[PDB]
Symmetry: C3
Subunit: 273 residues, 3 copies
């Protein structure tokens, strides 16, 4: 009865058929993502349940990338495809009650928080670096606020794309269009540019300069200064003049003519020989 | 007997099989679907993988937050300095016919929010910086349908309590420059305002302290609220009302009229 | 008679190894490189891991769509309300010397597109909101090289069919305000238009129905297309042409000139 041992070896020990070898384990493990990194070739879906995903801008998110301890970018999305069927990155919210932003960038630093560069195409096309559209009539499509000491809150620079001076004659730095409703619109009373100072400013409201020479401005009181010959295709209403170079009114001309007429008729009616 | 042979065949060698503990060691190096911490680079290289453009179910990465609280993704850094931006989107072919980023937003607050915090020391940075080298298209476009607001709203706030501190600031600053390399000039315009369908509103309206100071109407007439100056001549129509500016012709027209009548009285004077 | 000791040693016990079925259970809780569904938080904490800034191969996450259709990543939510934004980029140190986001775009359509859909009810919300507390730099900069378009193009569309519905709207709205906490005023300007190199084009050009109504030329002269008013005096040069506005000096000189001439005719006539 020496086989009271072989039976207990036949029972208590694992059959190769019923267990993975290390070579087979490696095969299986190699199809799984290592925490040290790997290459995913399919779709990675995130569907958090009662997972405790938080809104914190430091430790929150279904994906959280903390670069505090590392050089490099948090995420890079690259494509050299000639054409494709969708954008690289999509953010979408469907419910009208949604009360948060699609994207919030909270930037401290010494350079531009967000940088959008459109490279030069082989052939010009109507594409833009950034395109904004809103169908909400209750709010501005876009808002900008800044606290600049000596610069514009919005700075627009147009550079001539060509060496020849007369190439960009139809270009502008700022182009504004005011249109009626596309489907069935009967017109519009919308304004072009509205400049206001709710608290009141001492500065010029509109100031135009060319080649380091000021050319035209509208002051804080609404008076304008034009730097060259000007034209009104129409009448201009002004105050009566009280100084030599003030424009003369029709009334002023007529009063001075009438005054001289009276004096001369006086002399004529009373002169003798 | 020969029982041993069978057990030498059908039984597992310790050397060729991972133990329970060893298996735990190996499995812990793999990401659990319930979550984990990745310390290396995660690369996505889909290639005939059925990736879709769908703005709901598409993407090599898809994050659906419909049933959950919190952000979809947070990118955070407390590093003092580094060698690259947090997030980069890049497409290299000029024939590429989709956007780098598409925001399709419904909701009650701002779709995209960009905040530049107050730095310890003022610097030249901007919250958003746009450059285009495509001469065939606007660098940026904005379209809106506001009832009673601006499509673009610009607010400049004085950074200082003192009133004259921001005397060189502006809400909108425009520069018009020649080509950097070898440019001979430019004929580009500053501000171009048009209404292709035609509007009844003021083209330009200027106010200060809630009161109208200067405006240009839809017909191109202007209304100025204070004393004004033309460093030059101003051409106007002949006046037909008391406060209309008088032309040189009108002054000369009247002078000649009075001259004629007086000389006629003088030539026919009778004692 | 002692091999049994060698097999008790060299062979794996049932208790100390996982079966094929139990291995499967454990492996099924791990993410396959072929794809899967993550239900918890995935944290990235690289730390001397060789993460690079490269806009092609860098990032703790890298998505290369060169060989695949579809989007790189999609963030979707159908939630009614929530406690934070979908995507957050945050940098905390004021010495941070890289951007939060860099888009390096080549292609034929818009690099970044932001769309706010029509809400059930109008509300005070924007597609894009920009705010800087950095007094040393513009909140926003735009540069373009357009041949025949605006670097910035703003379109306001009437939200309603009725022509006067949008009478209080504008394409561009500018406000100039004092410092909120204790500000005593501001000297900031509204719109500053300049050409540092000098341009031949009109600085301000206003049109209605594609026809010029008002413009300021490169020399600062203006043309108004209709009746206009100055609530004040207008200073001009003395006229040298028929339709030039007449000065007070010119009126007085011509009146005095005729007076003299008439009085000398009267002083010397005889009959
Ligand atoms: Ni006589």
């Amino acid at each position: 009865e020496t086989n009271s041992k072989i039976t207990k070896l036949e029972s208590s020990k694992a059959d190769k058929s019923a267990v993975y070898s290390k070579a087979e384990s490696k095969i299986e493990l190699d199809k799984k993502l290592s925490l040290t990194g790997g290459i995913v070739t399919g779709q990675l879906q995130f569907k958090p349940n009662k997972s405790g995903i938080k809104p914190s801008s430091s430790v929150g998110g279904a994906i959280n990338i903390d670069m505090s301890k590392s050089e490099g970018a948090a995420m890079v999305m690259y494509t050299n495809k000639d054409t494709t069927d969708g954008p690289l990155m999509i953010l979408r919210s469907d419910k009208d009650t949604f009360d948060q932003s699609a994207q919030f960038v909270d930037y401290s630093g010494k350079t531009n928080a967000v940088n959008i560069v459109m490279r030069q195409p082989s052939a010009p096309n109507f594409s833009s670096a950034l395109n904004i559209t809103s169908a909400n009539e209750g709010g501005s499509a876009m808002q900008i606020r800044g606290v600049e000491k000596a610069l514009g809150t919005l700075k627009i620079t147009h550079e001539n794309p060509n060496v020849e001076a007369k190439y960009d004659e139809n270009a502008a730095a700022l182009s504004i269009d005011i249109v009626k409703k596309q489907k069935g619109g009967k017109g519009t009373a919308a304004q072009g540019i509205y400049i206001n100072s709710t608290s009141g400013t001492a500065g010029k409201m509109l100031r135009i300069r060319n080649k380091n020479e000021d050319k035209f401005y509208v002051g804080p009181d609404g008076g304008f200064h034009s730097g060259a010959n000007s034209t009104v295709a129409g009448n201009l209403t002004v105050k009566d003049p009280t100084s030599g170079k003030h424009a003369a009114t029709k009334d002023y001309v007529d009063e001075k003519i009438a005054e001289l007429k009276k004096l001369i008729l006086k002399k004529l009616e009373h002169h003798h020989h």
